[PDB]
Design brief:
This is part of a larger assembly, with two copies of chain A (about 55 residues).
Chain A lengths: L1 E2 L24 E2 L16 H6 L3
Antiparallel strand pairs in A: 1-2
PDB class: virus
Keywords: Bacteriophage, Capsid protein, image processing, virus
Entry title: bacteriophage SPP1 mature capsid protein
Chain lengths: ~55, ~55
Amino acid sequence: MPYWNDLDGDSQVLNDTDDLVPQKINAGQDKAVLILRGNAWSSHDLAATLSGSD
Amino acid sequence: AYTKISDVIVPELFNPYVINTTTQLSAFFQSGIAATDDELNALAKKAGGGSTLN
């Protein structure tokens, strides 16, 4: 993922007989991770009926 | 410096999949082989299965 980082100037004055000069902007970049997990477990049967509940 | 295309970060692009088709045209049809008889049908349908008749 990208971004445009913020700006910092100062000022000048303005005036008669003075002018202005522009300024520039930068950028930077980030990233991340995707993971996956899981598991499983079984049961039994005859014990399921003999037991009284599932 | 500049707004400077050399800074700002360039994305990339993608579009969905498209199915390729391998081509060696298979015809050699129609010819022998063709023209099913009733007899090779007597081989075809059950019952009285294979192996083959005479």
